[PDB]
Amino acid sequence: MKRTFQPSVLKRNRSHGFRARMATKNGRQVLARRRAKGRARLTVSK
Amino acid sequence: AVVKCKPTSPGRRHVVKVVNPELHKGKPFAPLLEKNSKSGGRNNNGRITTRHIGGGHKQAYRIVDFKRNKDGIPAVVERLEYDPNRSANIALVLYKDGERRYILAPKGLKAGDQIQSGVDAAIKPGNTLPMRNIPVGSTVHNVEMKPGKGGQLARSAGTYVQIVARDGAYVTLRLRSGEMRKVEADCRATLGEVGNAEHMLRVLGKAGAARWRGVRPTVRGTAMNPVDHPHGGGEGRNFGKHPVTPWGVQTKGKKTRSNKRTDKFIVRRRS
Amino acid sequence: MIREERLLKVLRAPHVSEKASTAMEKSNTIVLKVAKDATKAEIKAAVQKLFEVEVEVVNTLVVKGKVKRHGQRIGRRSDWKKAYVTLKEGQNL
RNA sequence: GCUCGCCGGAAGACCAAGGGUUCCUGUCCAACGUUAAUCGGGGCAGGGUGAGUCGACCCCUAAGGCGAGGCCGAAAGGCGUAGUCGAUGGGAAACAGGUUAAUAUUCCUGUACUUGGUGUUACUGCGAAGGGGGGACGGAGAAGGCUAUGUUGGCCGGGCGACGGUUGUCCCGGUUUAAGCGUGUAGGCUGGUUUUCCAGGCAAAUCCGGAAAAUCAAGGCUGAGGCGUGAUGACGAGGCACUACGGUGCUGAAGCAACAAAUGCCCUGCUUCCAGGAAAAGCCUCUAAGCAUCAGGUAACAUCAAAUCGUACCCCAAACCGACACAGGUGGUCAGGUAGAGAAUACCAAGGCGCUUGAGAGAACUCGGGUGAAGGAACUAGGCAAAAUGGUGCCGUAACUUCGGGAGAAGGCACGCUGAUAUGUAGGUGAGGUCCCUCGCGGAUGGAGCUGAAAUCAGUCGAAGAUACCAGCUGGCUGCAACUGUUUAUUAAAAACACAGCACUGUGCAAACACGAAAGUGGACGUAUACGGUGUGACGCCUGCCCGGUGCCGGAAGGUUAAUU
RNA sequence: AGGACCGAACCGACUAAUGUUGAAAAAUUAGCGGAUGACUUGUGGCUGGGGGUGAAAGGCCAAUCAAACCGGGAGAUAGCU
Ligand SMILES: NCC[C@H](O)C(=O)N[C@@H]1C[C@H](N)[C@@H](O[C@H]2O[C@H](CN)CC[C@H]2N)[C@H](O)[C@H]1O[C@H]1O[C@H](CO)[C@@H](O)[C@H](N)[C@H]1O
Ligand SMILES: NCC[C@H](O)C(=O)N[C@@H]1C[C@H](N)[C@@H](O[C@H]2O[C@H](CN)CC[C@H]2N)[C@H](O)[C@H]1O[C@H]1O[C@H](CO)[C@@H](O)[C@H](N)[C@H]1O
Ligand SMILES: [Mg+2]
Ligand SMILES: [Mg+2]
Ligand SMILES: [Mg+2]
Ligand SMILES: [Mg+2]
Ligand SMILES: [Mg+2]
Ligand SMILES: [Mg+2]
Ligand SMILES: [Mg+2]
Ligand SMILES: [Mg+2]
Ligand SMILES: [Mg+2]
Ligand SMILES: [Mg+2]
Ligand SMILES: [Mg+2]
Ligand SMILES: [Mg+2]
Ligand SMILES: [Mg+2]
Ligand SMILES: [Mg+2]
Ligand SMILES: [Mg+2]
Ligand SMILES: [Mg+2]
Ligand SMILES: [Mg+2]
Ligand SMILES: [Mg+2]
Ligand SMILES: [Mg+2]
Ligand SMILES: [Mg+2]
Ligand SMILES: [Mg+2]
Ligand SMILES: [Mg+2]
Ligand SMILES: [Mg+2]
Ligand SMILES: [Mg+2]
Ligand SMILES: [Mg+2]
Ligand SMILES: [Mg+2]
Ligand SMILES: [Mg+2]
Ligand SMILES: [Mg+2]
Ligand SMILES: [Mg+2]
Ligand SMILES: [Mg+2]
Ligand SMILES: [Mg+2]
Ligand SMILES: [Mg+2]
Ligand SMILES: [Mg+2]
Ligand SMILES: [Mg+2]
Ligand SMILES: [Mg+2]
Ligand SMILES: [Mg+2]
Ligand SMILES: [Mg+2]
Ligand SMILES: [Mg+2]
Ligand SMILES: [Mg+2]
Ligand SMILES: [Mg+2]
Ligand SMILES: [Mg+2]
Ligand SMILES: [Mg+2]
Ligand SMILES: [Mg+2]
Ligand SMILES: [Mg+2]
Ligand SMILES: [Mg+2]
Ligand SMILES: [Mg+2]
Ligand SMILES: [Mg+2]
Ligand SMILES: [Mg+2]
Ligand SMILES: [Mg+2]
Ligand SMILES: [Mg+2]
Ligand SMILES: [Mg+2]
Ligand SMILES: [Mg+2]
Ligand SMILES: [Mg+2]
Ligand SMILES: [Mg+2]
Ligand SMILES: [Mg+2]
Ligand SMILES: [Mg+2]
Ligand SMILES: [Mg+2]
Ligand SMILES: [Mg+2]
Ligand SMILES: [Mg+2]
Ligand SMILES: [Mg+2]
Ligand SMILES: [Mg+2]
Ligand SMILES: [Mg+2]
């Protein structure tokens, strides 16, 4: 039974990483929202 | 020749192949080769804009000479070669100065034949001349529409254009479609038809043979749902509609051409 | 030429363990905790200048710090660099 | 610790992905572990990952992304040129032995190789953002030559057996050695050398392409394996002694041949086919500007340098994805013996395990199996399930057919072991020896030794010889779909979809059409023997009548008719 | 030669039984189909919600699909319980 989550660090970083978020104007809005909320982890980068 | 395959399997029973013993059996001329990757019918937005395209064999692009601009220099047909990118075969030709090129092989062309281009060239197959210098009533191919742009008409296997008339700066041509068109008399054309007229006599015989050529299956609109096609729906086999394309335009007889820019060059439509 | 200030910052301490003792007693290799950003050239220069011994070769590894628990809270110890410095058969550091 | 059982193309070993300290040692047993726990992948503390050569980084690019200017768009933004990123692909170099509780192609020992910088010698036309070559490429099939590997023999060390025999044609074990360096073989490809000239290669070119002669008839490129050296070495049985009995010090004999043999190598080869099978750099070469008694290039030598990051451990799994120590899922590499076609199957090797509650009893009933008198589908919606068939060789085989099929039709016969033919045959391999030569990794003769079917005859045992595992049930009529394929992940695999074929239809290329406020893009680097839409659905014989309705196509006189005025 | 035949790996999923607070939110066991191709698989990429993709089942688009999920309009509205 293959499950929906198949980890891959390269794909993780390329889809949800810090630079991926900063590439677009809506990702920077995601980053601003998380900074305003006070998240201890901004992105999946680490 | 045209060969029928013996029915040793259901996929071989109905296969008819066109086999040319005179086609080159080695690799193509490397300097004249380019890469062309597949698209799947998808444009720069990533969407499918043409349907039923995808897969097939990997192919290299052979840079074929459609302009035929080396005027006055004779060339000898080094050989004939298979081109995966067109229904016609190509001919590798060598010029007297040591330049090799690819042209469309016309009917009757063979290794060792001599070809030339320009106003002073002889009226024989494979020779390129302005249609102002080609006699009227001649059968030409690879016809230019704009002087210097390169041949665009009658480029498929077995196709040709007939020079019907000539009126000042223009020549009327009968096209394979049955259309009469006006083209500047200064446009170029090659003499003779395009070889490989047996290309239309081949039968693929199986679905995999169509898949080898990059064609994907065609689902009929009647077999879809109303949300998928205007033809979809029904409890059983129902149609009750005027046939239409997947986007709602009538598809049996309704005319779609609209070009007032080039309407002036159409002497008569194909019918 | 690496400066003396850099050489003085490079080396952090000696490493004391059974493996380090065996290395010293069998191959003339001293094991040192060095700075994380210390290179083999910097370690060689620092050891020669400050320990007044001749060095044959330097091998380095980065040791990653362990995840530990203190009162049911989770912390991590820092990574550190370990250098195996081989001396020239008569130095006795 | 000794027995027993299980896996052994795995339930063994090594990795990538993913995880992240789960690794090793000491210590503890609260909680966790479906039970106890002294044990643990649990708690705590300490330790452990060593590289010029392995990988990343790095140079080069694919799909694709981003993209100075630019084009487009209410704004946000979209697209895209020059560029720049982007592996899953191309690009230099290390092997064997030893070693830790835990790392090793990284440490040690021995023996190597690569790239670059400097300095000294000599010889010298060097030079790119340009030219050429090369890198560089498919499927299938066939065979030869090899090797990894195995088997047997020889050799060496040990043994003489708890119960009849075992000094022998007896038993057990071992019989191993790398890269590198030298040679250049089976095989594959290609005619060499010189001269003259030239509308081609964004200009030049001595380079590539082309034209014309002369001359030599063997030159060159590639290439597994073998051989020598590496190696007077390392390893090596067991022995001579220790052990804190987990493990250690010293010695060390033989260390060969024949046969069989890969799916690995020659082989990016060869043959053939059509569906016609990446790119760029590294690399070789040619020059331009330029420099030109300098730079730069080539060879030799000496010296320096090769940074940084990963490296523990699990990795078909108790450590990854599944909430679990979960009968699920998960890419690559290795591939022993007997039997076997086999990577199936049975039993074993090396190696690893007995699956974290047990002990009893021996009710109904449930689950998974074995056997069954007489009957034999009478069961049931239905032969569901089960039972049955099953291998090889040979004989034999119907309607129908699109001539291929149907067909493994159906049906039947033989099958173990022993001896002989022949103390091992036909065939395969093939030493020494002999002889010759364009003397070598050579040719001819020869057959020793090894290996070794299948057949016939005779005998022989059992109820049974394809003895286990493994391994088609067969035939007749009929509907549907021509066929192989696809489909409702998780109640429907079908007669549904697709399909080759057929027809109608649009489209003359700035194509129709589709995605896009647009720019652009696909169609297509295609051009009517092409492309799009629609319907039908191999093939055979065919496809009748109706244009009144609805649509489409053509017409353009007349009637009506918008903005406009 | 072949969308050829028999049959492992590999891909699938026709039958039955078990299980159905399961070992498992789709499996196990015994049989079953394809197995050189319209095959299968790793790595990376692209297509985005009235949108995609679909050999077409309204199938699939993160255990969710006749219009995904997340946040907001929002305390929608509810002659109904
Ligand atoms: N010092 C030790 C003993 C000594 O060497 C010895 O006994 N040699 C015999 C010789 C005796 N002649 C051999 O017979 C065989 O070939 C004979 C043919 N020469 C025929 C019979 C056959 N059994 C016997 O096989 C052979 O056995 C030995 O060597 C064998 C070779 O590998 C090994 O397999 C075996 N393990 C080993 O005992
Ligand atoms: N493998 C067994 C499978 C099975 O038993 C089988 O199909 N058997 C066929 C039967 C089929 N009916 C037989 O025709 C033969 O007699 C026919 C009698 N009229 C005529 C044609 C002739 N070929 C066929 O010779 C025979 O082929 C078999 O035996 C051959 C010869 O040893 C083998 O080459 C072949 N590998 C093998 O299949
Ligand atoms: Mg998370
Ligand atoms: Mg189409
Ligand atoms: Mg069709
Ligand atoms: Mg259709
Ligand atoms: Mg459609
Ligand atoms: Mg339907
Ligand atoms: Mg509709
Ligand atoms: Mg009906
Ligand atoms: Mg070292
Ligand atoms: Mg390191
Ligand atoms: Mg024991
Ligand atoms: Mg821990
Ligand atoms: Mg442990
Ligand atoms: Mg407990
Ligand atoms: Mg622990
Ligand atoms: Mg800009
Ligand atoms: Mg862009
Ligand atoms: Mg780019
Ligand atoms: Mg780059
Ligand atoms: Mg890579
Ligand atoms: Mg280990
Ligand atoms: Mg061998
Ligand atoms: Mg194979
Ligand atoms: Mg390891
Ligand atoms: Mg358990
Ligand atoms: Mg498990
Ligand atoms: Mg698997
Ligand atoms: Mg097995
Ligand atoms: Mg248990
Ligand atoms: Mg019982
Ligand atoms: Mg019972
Ligand atoms: Mg009972
Ligand atoms: Mg029972
Ligand atoms: Mg029973
Ligand atoms: Mg029974
Ligand atoms: Mg009975
Ligand atoms: Mg009976
Ligand atoms: Mg009966
Ligand atoms: Mg009955
Ligand atoms: Mg009854
Ligand atoms: Mg049954
Ligand atoms: Mg009926
Ligand atoms: Mg069917
Ligand atoms: Mg039919
Ligand atoms: Mg029919
Ligand atoms: Mg499926
Ligand atoms: Mg279903
Ligand atoms: Mg367009
Ligand atoms: Mg047409
Ligand atoms: Mg269509
Ligand atoms: Mg139909
Ligand atoms: Mg009709
Ligand atoms: Mg097949
Ligand atoms: Mg079949
Ligand atoms: Mg099969
Ligand atoms: Mg089903
Ligand atoms: Mg099964
Ligand atoms: Mg429906
Ligand atoms: Mg789902
Ligand atoms: Mg809606
Ligand atoms: Mg409101
Ligand atoms: Mg409410």
d(CA B217, ligand 56 centre) in Å: 24
> Rg for chain A (alpha carbons), in Å?
12
Q: Beta carbon of B252 within 7 Å of strand D?
A: yes
- Please identify residues in chain B, positions 111-140, with a C-beta within 7 angstroms of any atom of strand D: none
With beta carbons less than 8 A apart as the criterion, state whether C32 and C86 touch: no
Per-residue tokens: B130:
């302005």
CB within 8 Å of A42: residues ≥ 6 apart: A18, A31, A34, A35
Give the span between the Cα atoms of B1 and A42, in whole angstroms: 70
With beta carbons less than 8 A apart as the criterion, state whether B43 and B74 touch: no
Helix (H) or strand (E) holding A6, with range, is none
Give the span between the Cα atoms of B172 and B153, in whole angstroms: 13
Per-residue tokens: C2:
């690496």
Give the span between the Cα atoms of B48 and B42, in whole angstroms: 4
Name beta bridge partners: C84: C31, C59
Question: What is the tally of structural domains in chain C?
Answer: 1
SS3 of residue C28 by DSSP? coil
The domains located in chain B, with CATH, are 1-113 (2.40.50.140), 117-194 (no CATH), 195-271 (4.10.950.10)
Give the span between the Cα atoms of B222 and B243, in whole angstroms: 10
Q: Which residues surround ligand 10, an ion (CB under 5 A)?
A: B 236
Q: Tell me, what amino acid is at B20?
A: N
* Long-range pairs, B145-148, Cβ under 8 A, ≥24: B145/B183, B145/B187, B146/B184, B146/B187, B147/B184, B147/B186, B147/B187, B147/B188, B148/B67
- Please identify residues in chain B, positions 41-100, with a C-beta within 7 angstroms of any atom of strand E: 42, 45-48, 51, 54-55
Provide the b/e sequence for C29-54 (b: ≥16 CB within 10 Å): bbbbebbeebeeebbbbbbbeebebe
Per-residue tokens: A6:
């198949």
Distance B220 CA to D498 C1' (A): 10
SS3 of residue C41 by DSSP? helix
Burial class (CB in 10 A: 0-12, 13-18, 19+), A3: exposed
The domains located in chain A, with CATH, are 1-46 (1.10.287.3980)
Distance B218 CA to D424 C1' (A): 69
Helix (H) or strand (E) holding A33, with range, is helix A25-37
Label the pairing between strands B143-144 and C11-14: unpaired
Using a 7 Å cut-off to protein CB atoms, list the covered nucleotides of chain E.
1-4, 24, 26-27, 37-39, 43-48, 52-58, 62-63, 66-67
With beta carbons less than 8 A apart as the criterion, state whether B197 and B107 touch: yes
Nucleotide nearest the Cα atom of B41 (by C1'): D522
Provide the resolution (angstroms).
2.9
SS3 of residue A42 by DSSP? coil
Give the span between the Cα atoms of C17 and C34, in whole angstroms: 16
Phi, psi of C24 (to 5 degrees): -60, -45
Per-residue tokens: B8:
């040793």
Q: Tell me, what amino acid is at C47?
A: V
SS3 of residue A1 by DSSP? coil
Q: Tell me, what amino acid is at B171?
A: V
Give the span between the Cα atoms of C28 and C86, in whole angstroms: 6
Give the span between the Cα atoms of C29 and C31, in whole angstroms: 6
Give the span between the Cα atoms of B148 and B130, in whole angstroms: 10
Q: Which residue has the tokens 């499950």?
A: A3
With beta carbons less than 8 A apart as the criterion, state whether C12 and C34 touch: yes
Torsion sign, CA atoms B89, B95, B101, B104: negative
Give the span between the Cα atoms of A43 and A20, in whole angstroms: 10
Q: What is the DSSP letter of C77?
A: P
Distance A1 CA to E12 C1' (A): 15
Q: What is the DSSP letter of C10?
A: H
With beta carbons less than 8 A apart as the criterion, state whether B33 and B226 touch: no
Give the span between the Cα atoms of B38 and B34, in whole angstroms: 13
Label the pairing between strands C55-63 and C67-70: unpaired
Q: What's chain B's length in residues? A: 271
Give the span between the Cα atoms of B178 and B156, in whole angstroms: 15
Task: Estimate to the nearest angstrom the gap between the alpha carbon of C2 and the chain centroid.
Answer: 17
**Residues B103, B105, B106, B109: what is their CA dihedral angle, to the nearest 10 degrees?**
110
Q: What is the DSSP letter of C26?
A: H
With beta carbons less than 8 A apart as the criterion, state whether B250 and B243 touch: yes
- 3-state SS track over chain B: CEEECCCCCCCCCCCEEECCCCECCCCCCHHHEEECCCCCCECCCCCECCCCECCCCCCEEECECCCCCCCCCCEEEEEEECCCCCCCCEEEEEECCCCEEEEECECCCCCCCEECECCCCCCCCCCEEECCCCCCCCEEECEECCCCCCEEECCCCCCCEEEEEEECCEEEEECCCCCEEEEECCCEEEECCECCHHHHHCECCCHHHHHCCCECCCCCHHHCCCCCCCCCCCCCCCCCCCCECCCCCECCCCCCCCCCCCHHHEEECCC
Give the span between the Cα atoms of B101 and B65, in whole angstroms: 7
Distance A2 CA to D347 C1' (A): 37
Domain extent for C60: 2-93
Q: For residue B16, how many other CB atoms are within 10 A of its CB?
A: 14
Among B210, B232, B237, which Cα is nearest to B221's? B232
Q: What is the DSSP letter of C66?
A: P
With beta carbons less than 8 A apart as the criterion, state whether B190 and B106 touch: yes
